[PDB]
Swiss-Prot record, chains A, B:
Belongs to the dihydroorotate dehydrogenase family. Type 1 subfamily. It comes from Trypanosoma cruzi (strain CL Brener). Binds 1 FMN per subunit. Homodimer. Optimum pH is 7. The active site is at C131 (nucleophile). This is Dihydroorotate dehydrogenase (fumarate). One of its GO terms (cellular component) is cytoplasm. Optimum temperature is 37 degrees Celsius. Substrate binds at K44, N68, S69, M70, G71, L72, N128, N133, N195, S196. The keyword Protease does not apply. It is found in: Cytoplasm. Transmembrane segments: none annotated. Gene3D superfamilies: Aldolase class I. The gene is pyr4.
């Protein structure tokens, strides 16, 4: 019985990794994720320049999940590129580097410089599309013309396999259109579904107040709120992108949640809110829990059930 | 202390009602809602002709909420019109009638016939904009040009105050666009936020199967999963539509949840999943619980706190 995966020319001890943004901002964070039982790690989505992010409180968690409007606080691309090129121990596990430029040109400038490091050290790029465009326009992955532009220019500038982090969609016509856009790009080898469910609002009944300060309390939702949304997105893209991998993200707190992701089509399984709340010891628990489900069902490897969710009649 | 209120030229005993589609399809259901302690009731969204809906199982509930792909089973407009015209006891509470025609012409046809019954009896129209659209296109409320057409045509055809049932949005630019469309229509006097969160996917780990039959297991989510999404949509429209009322729907299981809807801006509070699960006795529990929170806080009226959610700094 084993959780090993071999994909994108790397080997992974198990499918678990952090979700971008959680336990991955500082060198300390990245060393901690490297020391953990996770099968891989992803660095915080970065911009060319360092960012302080939004005012606090900007993240809160609760029994059913979390809300955040962090505002992309990060140490800047030069720091993450240095961690990839000089500090990360690739004998421990593979590294993904996520970027989230504020314009197409900013993303192009970073992927041009990542390319040689990607080729020589094997760091893998995750482009965050679930992210700001021009203010007053929807985030980039909700604007399919901007998404196509971004992917064309990054493909040309990078020239190497990469993947994309996608927001959730809610309408079949959107699943169809988004998968079609992605399928125009052969260098997009994985698709991570999903980023946070956007612009939720948590209100505290005692204080009669929202719980985060930015954006009048509005922010992205993660955790138990979003598992069925996450599963739908994973499966929708799994069915529509037969030449790409899908990584699952959203609502994983247990090996059974990871099992459902994998049944939906997930290759790698990322952990955001639950990891923020529990800490990196979650990875040993998730592994043990998933292996237990596999033993009860007689499954020896992940491929025996990945994408094999049954439908009715 | 009572929770009585006046809206849209009608008096309501309390702000609670069923959500369209729950306990309101048959004459029996409508009589049971009328006999309940709810403040109002809404009939099942209807088409011109009766529909059997999708194959079963088509609804499933779980501790965190529900998933459905009912396929609009309903008795047909003629039946709900007859109920509004001849069978509903208006001395007991107000009645809303929900229409969900498959095209703009179908909706125009039903509203021209509804108009004289609305004038004579005071039945209120709720137009469901989660209805079907043209080839390769999203639901109507996710196509702002189709939305504007629908609202232009219904407004012209009906000529009386009405409301609209909206799907959730997840992007601030979308809140801005959708609110601006609605604000073009002075006859749109209430906006109900929100319909189910579209195209989620629930998977049972034991059976490795989806739990509903239609659409490969994909369906709309309600209940606890959707509360912060519903609060966000309520508050976004409350802020952007100052000359309309907002009706809140999504994730109400308790008087505390209702309190949060009202703080966000809700005038009426609709109950879907929790009503399907608990039955019409829920309405006395909700009233008691809301009155108890008001008493502890020192609030004597709903107006004292409606829309008064506090932001940080
Ligand atoms: C505090 C916080 C920061 C985040 N920052 C990023 C980010 O920088 N880049 C990104 O792709 N996703 C970011 N996310 C989204 C997560 O990667 C993930 O998609 C989301 O939280 C859903 O997974 P979960 O339900 O396990 O939380 C962030 C989430 C949280 C909670
Ligand atoms: C079984 C079922 C049938 C529904 N049918 C309709 C409908 O006919 N029209 C409509 O506007 N919304 C309909 N809905 C959506 C609800 O009115 C409501 O917007 C949604 O369930 C979210 O509220 P909740 O969290 O209380 O369930 C239906 C929901 C369920 C669960
Ligand atoms: O940093 C975040 O807020 C964030 N949180 C998530 O849940 N997922 C994400 O992908 C991100 C980053 C995307 C992003 C999200 C933002 C949300 C609210 C306000 C600002 C931003 C922002 C600003 C600059 C660059 C990126 C962002
Ligand atoms: O009847 C529903 O499935 C339904 N469920 C909800 O959660 N909200 C709704 O608004 C509806 C009705 C909207 C709707 C929803 C549908 C979902 C799957 C397949 C068909 C329909 C459909 C067909 C004709 C007219 C309306 C529909």
């Amino acid at each position: 019985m084993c959780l090993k995966l071999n994909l994108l020319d790397h080997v992974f001890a198990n499918p678990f990794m952090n979700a971008a943004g959680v336990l991955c901002s500082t060198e300390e964070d990245l060393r901690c994720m490297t020391a953990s039982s996770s099968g891989a790690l992803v660095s915080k989505s970065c911009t060319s320049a360092p960012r302080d992010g939004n005012p606090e409180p900007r993240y809160m968690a609760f029994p059913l999940g979390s809300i955040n409007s962090m505002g992309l606080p990060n140490l800047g691309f030069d720091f993450y590129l240095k961690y990839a090129s000089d500090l990360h121990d690739y004998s421990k596990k593979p590294l993904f580097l996520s970027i989230s430029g504020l314009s197409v040109e900013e993303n192009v400038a970073m992927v041009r410089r990542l390319a040689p490091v990607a080729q020589e050290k094997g760091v893998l790029l995750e482009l965050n599309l679930s992210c700001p465009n021009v203010p007053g326009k929807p985030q980039v992955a909700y604007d399919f013309e901007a998404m196509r532009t971004y992917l064309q220019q990054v493909s040309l500038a990078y020239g190497l396999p990469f993947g994309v982090k996608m927001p959730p969609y809610f309408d079949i016509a959107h699943f169809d259109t988004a998968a079609a856009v992605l399928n125009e790009f052969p260098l997009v080898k994985f698709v991570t579904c999903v980023n946070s469910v956007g612009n939720g609002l948590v209100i505290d009944a005692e204080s009669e107040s929202v719980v985060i300060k930015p954006k009048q309390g509005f922010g992205g939702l993660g955790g138990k709120y979003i598992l069925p949304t996450a599963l739908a997105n994973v499966n929708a893209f799994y069915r529509r992108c037969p030449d790409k991998l899908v990584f699952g993200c959203g609502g994983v707190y247990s090996g059974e949640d990871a099992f459902l992701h994998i049944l939906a089509g997930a290759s790698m399984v990322q952990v955001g809110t639950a990891l923020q709340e529990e800490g990196p010891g979650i990875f040993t628990r998730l592994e043990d829990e998933l292996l237990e489900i596999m033993a009860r069902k007689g499954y020896r490897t992940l491929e025996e059930f990945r994408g094999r969710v049954k439908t009715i009649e």
